[PDB]
Amino acid sequence: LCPFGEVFNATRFASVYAWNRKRISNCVADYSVLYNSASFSTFKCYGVSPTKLNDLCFTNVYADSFVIRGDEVRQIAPGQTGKIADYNYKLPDDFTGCVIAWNSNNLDSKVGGNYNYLYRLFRKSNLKPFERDISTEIYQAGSTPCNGVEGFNCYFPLQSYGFQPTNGVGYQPYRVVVLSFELLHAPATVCG
Amino acid sequence: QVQLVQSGAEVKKPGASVKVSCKASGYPFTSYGISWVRQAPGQGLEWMGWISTYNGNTNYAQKFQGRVTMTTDTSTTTGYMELRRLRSDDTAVYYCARDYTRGAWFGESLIGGFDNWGQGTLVTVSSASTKGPSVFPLAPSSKSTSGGTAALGCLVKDYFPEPVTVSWNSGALTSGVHTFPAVLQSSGLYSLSSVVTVPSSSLGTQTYICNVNHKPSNTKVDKKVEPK
Amino acid sequence: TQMQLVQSGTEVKKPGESLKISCKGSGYGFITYWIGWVRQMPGKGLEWMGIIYPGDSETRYSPSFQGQVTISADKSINTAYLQWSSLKASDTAIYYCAGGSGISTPMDVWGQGTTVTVASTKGPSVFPLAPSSGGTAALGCLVKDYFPEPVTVSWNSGALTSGVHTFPAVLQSSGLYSLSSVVTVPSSSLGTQTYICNVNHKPSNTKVDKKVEPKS
Amino acid sequence: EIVLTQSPGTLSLSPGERATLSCRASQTVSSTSLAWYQQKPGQAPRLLIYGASSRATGIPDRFSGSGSGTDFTLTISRLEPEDFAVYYCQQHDTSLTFGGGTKVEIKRTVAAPSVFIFPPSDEQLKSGTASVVCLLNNFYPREAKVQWKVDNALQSGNSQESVTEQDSKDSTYSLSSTLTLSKADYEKHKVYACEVTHQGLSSPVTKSFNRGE
Amino acid sequence: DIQLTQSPDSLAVSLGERATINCKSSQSVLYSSINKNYLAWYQQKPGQPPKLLIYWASTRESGVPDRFSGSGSGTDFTLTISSLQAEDVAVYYCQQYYSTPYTFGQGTKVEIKRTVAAPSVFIFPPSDEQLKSGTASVVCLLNNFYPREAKVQWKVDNALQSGNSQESVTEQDSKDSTYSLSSTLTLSKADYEKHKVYACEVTHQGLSSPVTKSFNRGE
Amino acid sequence: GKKLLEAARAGQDDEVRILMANGADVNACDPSGITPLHLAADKGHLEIVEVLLKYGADVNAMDVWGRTPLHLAAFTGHLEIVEVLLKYGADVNACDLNGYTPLHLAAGRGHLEIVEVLLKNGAGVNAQDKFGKTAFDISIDNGNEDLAEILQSSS
Ligand SMILES: *[C@@H]1O[C@H](CO)[C@@H](O[C@@H]2O[C@H](CO)[C@@H](O[C@@H]3O[C@H](CO)[C@@H](O)[C@H](O)[C@@H]3O)[C@H](O)[C@H]2NC(C)=O)[C@H](O)[C@H]1NC(C)=O
């Protein structure tokens, strides 16, 4: 009864720095479609198994999705460090969610480079878990006061990806959706 | 295996409004949206509209804001459309179908589209009124081909409306029959004819009959064929 | 059940060489399954050595087994493998491959397991035993100097299946194996029919039949 | 929005061949927001191909889709005598726009039509009108030319033409061309000639008749 | 690493009553959000791969009846079997899976309990071809006893031996839980010929006093 | 081994001497991937630079932006560190993601000697910026035209 098609079978996925929230509840959710889709290549799940969650049911089915370069699909795991893992989207510790990813090279790429998907490269601090930062202002490397101009120490933070149909076996952009099943002691707990 | 059912063909007069219905069964009616598409006789389709099934917020076509209203009921799992300000040029066919292009929950584009349709519905409108048929024989002329064949026909004109149930000797002849599509004329009325070719031997050896019944005007007529 | 786990057969080696064992899974939803390995000493509990994922070959090892055992996976035929670089005398045990969906999940489905040992080959020998004075008398036969296990013992080709006790084979001082089987029989039919110990050995593929009578 | 024309409007092919329908737009479009639908005559439409590469439930494996950018192709591979229908390529990237439809027809040899021309009897005299008819049968293909001449003079705005669909047993058509007029104008002009020119005819065939004959 | 412990290692209870096993951890095994213990209870009969019995320390895996239960909290838990069957003899294991890695317990052995049984003791020397091989194996056999505890000793011409008797024990018996034990003594041909009278001594609760069977070589 | 970075920044030669004699890293890096040669060039502690390059420090190292020590050392205006880096054999036509050539910074900061010392061993004048511009126009842009005619004539 939960529209799992819209989150899974959509058309436009935003970039990692503009990852899309998708809150979902108030249904009965069927997982057999996720059981044996025969197309996901990296179905991995932490804390709670998906073969046996059918009995139990809470709220907080917080789940999101984006598109990301293939290799770093391993870097999305609690207690794991990396460039995008630290710097664009980082899981907390004590995980309870469930990661799913699959290849979509056939459609989300155009010869010559599809310059639409970008990702942050640096940040002064390191982000807290499950928080979003979107900001396009310049980076001031050194002691030069920079207001709105680009220079030897003023650099554009956001950088564009490179997607090719004939890219490397990890260089194609995969689609990633991660679900996260939690609970709260408050009443009015809608099941699934 | 899901079932879609629509109402029957309708006849109206100009300036009125027309309400039609679509009934869905065999699937969770609250999980998919409804799509309505029309087609003019002999022309390609054109998109009327799409409507969600949970939030009630919908998406109409750009060209049809002030004429069509869309409603859905979850209790009976039905979808009704009411079209206003009809004109004589709008006589057409309509179809209801299940959408897989706009998600019925949040409303974003997906992969796929109109999967299962209905049976189609026929709509007509004119300034004319129901009228009995005008029958006319066409036996082969005095110059009927000797070394060849002759053509036998029965012609109907000024009959309102479509259809007409036409048979020759009450279904005795089944092969070589041609019934013609209804064609409009400047008067706005109807015309049709039915033809079979026969060998020259059957010219003066057997007499044929056209029976025509027009149920909307419940008129039954029978006419023999006399060679001349 | 919805998941099938299979393993390789029983096979033992001399010490020094490597070791290749494998575990395969089959069914619906296997793509959400991790493969772990469990060890049992003879007469003891379970120990954990390693766990792995079939797709991306993510490995986790026990704190006490790094370097001695190699864990590998292959997603093409969708199985997992265990390698042993060197074999010791203390590596004779029974190993299980088992499946668990996810991390921090119950280890629910299991295979059958396979055993490994180290010794030097020899075929067995069998000797009889019959008592004399009554009530019931105990007949038997013993077998010595065989390896590997097992030997199928039999009593009149299985015609007598009550009061049978075959002693679980136990290694002696020099590492070989000995066994003994006994029954109790009423003293009425002592000298009417024969008693025969049948022993079959697959590794030596030898059939031996031993005749038992009381001593005059 | 986006213009869409498949072209050609008729893809008449002999049974036992391959069909490659081409769909084209003006601007660029996604490879995941377009579909192909089928329309049998007198029967409701159905879904054939979605996502430009995938297939729906219970679809024969002869159908495939490909293409990208602004050009798309549907391949039928095997043409059976059930697959004759009007096909539509449809987009939904921005709003949604349907194609123009394409007709696939059975090739056969040339056809020689047979023509019968009949004027009305006094059953039209009872009314205040007059209606003459020309009928052609067993011609090929749909194109043809028919004309009238009232005393060697063609008049416009008074004739209607009707054609049937493809024949199920021989795959040909029969056409009716009817000329209507007021009865008063019927009897003050003497000669009426019905002429036909068509590729199926070697020469234009003419039949001239009189009010009394 | 998290450590466990079980109690008792072995247990003796009659048929059709309650049996208990207690498993204690080293640290807390509770997960913060999900208030369900990450423990597991396994059963394993001899010659069998294990079959999971209890998961999440309180939830019953499909395919087993209600007669098993688990309770506890914090770091201490207990599994109880009610109205046991004769089929219910196996080895039971507690193991957590809170985080990499997991550590099992030492193990639990269950055994049916019933009345004391009178055992039977026999003695045998080997046959001639055994001696001509170069070895001599003399066997003491003791059978159909209950309880298990029964001391066994040898005597060579009323003199003791050291490191010569090997003891073998069988498993539970399906009929009346009476077991069989053997003591094997191996020696040289000459050393066998170096002495006359061999005696075997047994001690058991089924015997008011130790029972000795002795025999002289060749007679 | 993060001590050497701040030691080189602070310009305490004895501390860097003893630490690298004790086994300090030759390529110790921060999260931003900066190199001790970069810090030494920024602070102009020539002795630390020569000492570090004696053991074979990363003369062609790049940070997250691809900055090379020659670029920063030209930016500050240190006369001898640039030429010792050049004589060791670092790249002179190196350009970051922004595509800044050392000649570009040299013209921007109005430092002339670095231009010719780069040109001595074959510095390239074919630099392409966002518009493909070379060092000539920037040299005339910096407000000091006396630089521009030299690159015009040094070709
Ligand atoms: C997203 O789109 C995919 C693509 O079609 C959907 O997958 C489809 O899911 C249905 C679920 O019922 C599958 O139907 C099943 O087919 C099997 C095999 O024929 C049959 O044994 C079952 O009884 C059932 O009818 C269908 O095959 C499957 N299609 C493909 C190509 O995999 C999916 O449901 C959509 N939604 C989500 C959330 O993924």
Q: Which domain holds residue C144?
A: 125-212
Search chain D and give the residue with CA nearest A110: D69
Token digits of residue D101: 């439809």
Domain count of the fold of chain B: 2
Residue with tokens 């930016």: F75
Residues B29 and B61 in one domain: yes
**What are the chain A neighbours of C100 within 8 Å (beta carbons)?**
49
How many residue pairs from chains A and C have C-beta atoms closer than 8 A?
40
**Strand, helix or coil for residue F46:** helix
Rounded Cα distance, B102 and B81, in Å: 19
User: What's the number of domains chain C is made of?
Assistant: 2
Mutate to test the interface with E, among C125, C144, C166, C210 (most CBs of E within 10 A): C144
Last residue of a domain, one of C116, C143, C165: C116
Same domain, B118 and B138: no
Rounded Cα distance between C99 and C101, Å, is 7
**Per-window interface: F 107-126 vs A, CB < 8 A:** 108
Same domain membership, residue B143 and residue B107: no
The shortest C-alpha distance from C99 to chain E (Å) reads 12
Q: How far is the CA of B106 from the centre of ligand 1 (A)?
A: 21
Alpha carbon of E107: minimum distance to chain A alpha carbons (Å): 27
CA distance E4 to D69: 64
Residue the block writes with tokens 């699937």 = B27
Nearest chain A alpha carbon to B104: A3
Asked which of B84, B101, B125 is the last residue of a domain, the reply is B125
**Per residue in A126-146, is it b (16+ CB within 10 Å) or e — as a string?**
eeeeeeeeeeeebeebeeeeb
Instruction: Give every CB contact of residue A33 below 8 A, 6+ residues apart in sequence.
Output: A4
Residues C110 and C11 in one domain: yes
Structural domain of B214: 134-225
- CA separation, residue D105 to residues A14, A81, B39, B150, D6 (Å): 46, 64, 21, 29, 16
Please give, one letter per residue, the 3-state secondary structure of C148-159.
CCCEEEEECCCC
Residues contacting residue D29 through CB under 8 Å, at least 6 positions apart? D2, D69, D70, D91, D93
B112 and B172 both lie in a single domain: no
C94, C33 Cβ separation under 8 angstroms: no
Do C172 and C96 lie in one domain? The reply is no
Clarify whether residues B36 and B146 are in a common domain: no
**Token pair belonging to C214:** 């009381």
* Residue labelled with tokens 């309505």: B36
Residues of C whose CB is below 8 A from E126: 127
| A192 Cα to the center of ligand 1, angstroms | 20
- Interface contacts (C, E; CB < 8 Å): 93
Using CA atoms, how far apart are residues F111 and E58, in angstroms rounded to an integer? 78
| β-pair type (E150-156, E135-145) | unpaired
Nearest chain A residue to C104 by CA: give it.
Answer: A47
Q: What b/e sequence results for B89-118 when a residue is b if at least 16 CB atoms lie within 10 Å of its CB, and e otherwise?
A: ebbbbbbbbbbbbbbbbeeebbbbbbbbbb
B185 is written with which tokens? 């004329």
Interface test with D, best of B114, B122, B152 (most D CBs within 10 A): B114
Residues D179 and D169 sit within 8 Å (Cβ to Cβ): no
Which residues of chain B have a CB within 8 Å of the CB of A1? 28, 30-31
| Listed residues B100, B125, B150: the one ending a domain | B125
CB contact under 8 A, E143 and C180: no
Mutation site for A-interface testing, chosen from D50, D68, D72, D92 by largest number of A Cβ within 10 Å? D68
- Is there a single domain that holds both residue B87 and residue B157? no
Cβ within 8 Å of residue C132, ≥6 positions away: C214, C215
CATH of the domain at C166: 2.60.40.10
Alpha carbons within 13 angstroms on the beta-carbon side of residue B117 total 19
Cα A52 to averaged position of ligand 1 atoms, centre (Å): 21
| Environment class of E142 (CB within 10 Å of its CB; exposed 0-12, middle 13-18, buried 19+) | buried
Set of chain C residues whose Cβ sits within 8 Å of the Cβ of A49: 32, 100-102, 105
Taking the C-alpha atoms of residue B181 and residue B167, their distance in angstroms, rounded to an integer, is 15
Single out the residue of B162, B139, B149, B157 nearest to residue B223, CA to CA. B139
Cα-to-centroid distance, A33 and ligand 1 (Å): 7
d(CA E198, CA E123): 9
HEC sequence for D87-106:
EEEEECCCCCEECCCEECCC
Domains of chain A: 1-129+160-192 (3.30.70.1840)
Which of C93, C116, C139 is the last residue before a domain boundary?
Answer: C116
Q: How far apart are CA B194 and CA B184, in angstroms?
A: 16
Cα gap B40→B9, rounded to integer Å: 14
Contact C158, C196 (CB under 8 A): no
Tokens 């985080």 label which residue? E99
Instruction: Give chain D positions within 8 Å (CB) of B120.
Output: 44
CATH of the domain at B179: 2.60.40.10
Which residues on neighbouring strands pair with residue B168, listed in sequence order? B210
* Judgement on whether residues B116 and B142 belong to the same structural domain of the protein: no
C137/C92 same-domain check: no
DSSP C62-124: -TT-TTTEEEEEETTTTEEEEEESS--TT--EEEEEEEESSBS----EE---EEE-----B--
What are the beta bridge partners of residue D109? none
Q: By CA distance, what is E31's nearest residue in A?
A: A94
Rounded CA-CA distance F70/F59 in Å is: 9
Q: Which chains touch B (3 or more CB pairs under 8 A)?
A: A, D
Q: Whose CA is nearest to atom 25 of ligand 1?
A: D57
DSSP string, chain B: --EEEE---EEE-TT--EEEEEEEESS-TTSS-EEEEEE-TTS-EEEEEEE-SSS--EEE-TT-TTTEEEEEETTTTEEEEEE-S--GGG-EEEEEEE-SSB-TTT--BBS----SB---EEEEE-S---B--EEEEE---TT--SSSEEEEEEEEES-BSS--EEEETTTT--SSEEE------TTS--EEEEEEEEEGGGTTT---EEEEEETTTTEEEEEE----
Output the CA–CA distances (angstroms, integers) from residue A49 to A97, A130, C33, in the order listed: 9, 22, 9
Same domain, C14 and C111: yes
Ordered by where they begin, the domains of chain F are: 1-91 (1.25.40.20), 92-155 (1.25.40.20)
Of the CA atoms within 13 Å of residue D91, those in its CB half-sphere come to 26
Residues B148 and B208 in one domain: yes
Q: Give the number of other Cβ atoms within 10 Å of residue D115's Cβ.
A: 19
> How many angstroms separate the CA of residue E153 from the nearest CA in chain A?
56
Q: CA of A130, closest CA in chain B: separation in Å?
A: 23
- Calpha distance C35→C99 (Å, rounded): 5
Check: CB of residue E33 under 8 Å from CB of residue A94: yes
Which of C91, C116, C141 is the last residue before a domain boundary? C116
Touching E (3+ Cβ pairs <8 A), the chains are: A, C
Asked which of B108, B125, B142 is the last residue of a domain, the reply is: B125
Is there a single domain that holds both residue C7 and residue C99?
Answer: yes
Token pair in block for residue F16:
């860097």
The minimum-distance atom of ligand 1 relative to the CA of A38 is 32
End-to-end CA distance of chain C: 60
Inform me whether the C-beta atom of residue A158 falls under 8 Å from chain F C-beta atoms: no
Coil/strand/helix, residue E44: strand
- Pocket, ligand 1, Cβ cutoff 6 A: A 4-5, 8-9, 33
Contact C127 E130 (CB under 8 A): yes
Asked if D137 and D174 count as a contact pair (C-beta separation under 8 A), the reply is yes
| Strand-strand pairing, A154-155 and D191-197 | unpaired
The experimental method is cryo-EM
Verify C-B touch: 3 or more CB pairs within 8 A: no
Q: Compute the distance between CA of residue F100 and CA of residue F105 in angstroms, rounded to an integer.
A: 7
Give the helix/strand (H/E) hosting F54: helix F46-54
Please tell me the distance from the alpha carbon of residue E136 to that of residue E193, in angstroms, as a whole number. 10
Q: Label the pairing between strands B10-12 and B121-125.
A: parallel
Tokens at residue F96, please? Answer: 């970051």
* Residues of chain A neighbouring D31 (CB-CB closer than 8 A): 106-107
Structural domains in chain E plus CATH codes = 4-112 (2.60.40.10), 120-216 (2.60.40.10)
Starting at the edge strand that comes first in sequence, how are the strands of the sheet with E108-109 ordered?
Answer: E59-60, E51-55, E39-44, E91-96, E108-109
How many CB atoms are closer than 10 A to CB D164?
A: 16
User: What is the CA angle A43-A47-A50, rounded to 5?
Assistant: 50
3-state secondary structure C28-52: CCHHHCEEEEEEECCCCCEEEEEEE
CB C142 within 8 A of CB C179: yes
Same domain, yes or no: C153 and C206:
yes
The first and second tokens of residue B194, run together, are 């039915």
Does E20 contact C at CB distance below 8 Å? no
Same domain for B203 and B167: yes
Q: Are residues B9 and B121 in the same domain?
A: yes
Same domain for B117 and B48, yes or no, is: yes
Tell me if B84 sits within 8 A of B12, measured CB to CB. Answer: no
CA distance E156 to B37: 107
Distance CA C39, CA C33 (A): 20
Closest-CA distance of chain B to residue D28, Å: 17
Does one domain contain both B189 and B100?
Answer: no
Q: Is A51 touching C (CB cutoff 8 A)?
A: yes
Tell me, what DSSP letter sits at residue A126?
A: -
Residue F64: CB partners within 8 Å, gap ≥ 6? A121, A122, F32, F33
A residues 4-43 lying closer than 8 A (beta carbon) to B:
5-6, 9-12
Say yes or no for a CB contact (<8 Å) between D33 and A11. yes
Q: What is the residue-wise DSSP string for B98-139?
A: E-SSB-TTT--BBS----SB---EEEEE-S---B--EEEEE-
